[PDB]
Design a protein around this ligand. Sequence first.
Ligand SMILES: Oc1ccc(C(c2ccc(O)cc2)=C2[C@H]3CCC[C@@H]2CCC3)cc1
Ligand SMILES: Oc1ccc(C(c2ccc(O)cc2)=C2[C@H]3CCC[C@@H]2CCC3)cc1
Lengths: 10, 10, 232, 227
Amino acid sequence: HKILHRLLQD
Amino acid sequence: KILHRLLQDS
Amino acid sequence: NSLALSLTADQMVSALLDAEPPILYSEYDPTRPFSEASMMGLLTNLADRELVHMINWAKRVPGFVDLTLHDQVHLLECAWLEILMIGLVWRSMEHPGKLLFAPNLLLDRNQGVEGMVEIFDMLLATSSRFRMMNLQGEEFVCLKSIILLNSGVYTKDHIHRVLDKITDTLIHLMAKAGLTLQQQHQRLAQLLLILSHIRHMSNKGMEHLYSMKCKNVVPLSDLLLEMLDAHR
Amino acid sequence: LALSLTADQMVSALLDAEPPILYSEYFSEASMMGLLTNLADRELVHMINWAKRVPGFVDLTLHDQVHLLECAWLEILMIGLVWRSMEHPGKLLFAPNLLLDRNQGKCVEGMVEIFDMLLATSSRFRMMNLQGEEFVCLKSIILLNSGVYTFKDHIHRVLDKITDTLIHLMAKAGLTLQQQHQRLAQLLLILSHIRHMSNKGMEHLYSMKCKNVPLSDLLLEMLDAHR
Ligand SMILES: Oc1ccc(C(c2ccc(O)cc2)=C2[C@H]3CCC[C@@H]2CCC3)cc1
Ligand SMILES: Oc1ccc(C(c2ccc(O)cc2)=C2[C@H]3CCC[C@@H]2CCC3)cc1
């Protein structure tokens, strides 16, 4: 999965 | 330039 | 002085409609299927012939004649693929899932080349967008002319003057169509936002052509090589 | 919730969600791209959090949010750069402590062409007297529009709302009806050029990857999303 996923969730 | 010619004629 | 600024919206639409290039036919015979070389061969032959009509079409666009020979070359070098694409998208508007490159050349998503499906989908998406918006021919010819004058304007006050005139022309059509003031603004915004995507497809398409050139796949015409080199 | 907000509440929300102006690390080719890579990477983190504060963006699925950001991240950085450099003609304010000239874009191959396009866009905003309220609307439009056809009704509805908001600002500025249509059209046409610069810059960054300054992990992901 992409890093962008985490930053959009947190 | 071809584009130059086709533009100027006639 | 100029004549483009003088024309009314109705006379603007009329001039653009009268200037419309014909729909050219392909050399396609539904005998052999398409290889990566044959398909691009057909499209290159088609696009090269379309360009000749576009150049003479551009000279029919109000205000374009008033510009210098150098500026006319720049605007066409920058927007030729955009104009080809929006024309393609317009032709394929009533053919869902298909692209009408020519009346005898209808290509599917399956048909078409390493990196062509990405461009096809965006083209299909644009066509599907025009269909849902119920794009009119009067709006199409305005958008196509906007692309010609805009796409190379920042790479002038008269060009922006004609651009403002085309804006007025678009709003006049929408008002005639019975749209409310906020519906005109929204639709106007919707139409011009699509041009951003057409620009995107063009840049993607341009890079594909340069890839095809250096790979020495199917030979490009002498004019298409010039138009492609201008983008570097 | 985005559709419920009025034009005033739309502007205030976007103005309140504005990312900060970050500073550069306190040129050749390597040093400049090093500073810009570091800067852009820190801006992305604020952009992502800014996007989540954009009305209607939260309502989208996680996948759609990712797709939109991947499509327009360089566009958004650029229009921010262009806006910051508005009152610095001939200059590009990448950061308050990093002012770059057109001649400084020459020591990187194929970057001086992107500089001129950026400078021209900034000059265009200056001539149009672009307002901050207008700018935050345009940037939000880029976020929602740039990747909407690479997929919808909700996004198009929010786009219509921002359009209504744009007109509202001009109508409150004292512009006549036809002046509102023309200015709106002029703004949206610039977005087509911002896309062009983005695709050019994207191809420039790809050359950077195919040469090994080291791009950040986040930047490499945003870059890879453009194949
Ligand atoms: O009307 C059109 C005619 C052809 C095209 C062609 C084309 C093909 C070969 C060329 O040498 C130049 C363009 C384009 C299409 C859309 C973008 C790039 C290319 C290739 C894929 C399809 C697009 C529109
Ligand atoms: O605010 C901005 C900060 C940086 C940038 C980016 C950038 C630089 C390095 C990166 O790794 C990623 C992006 C650049 C600018 C815009 C085009 C791409 C590049 C190269 C020259 C100017 C653009 C705007």
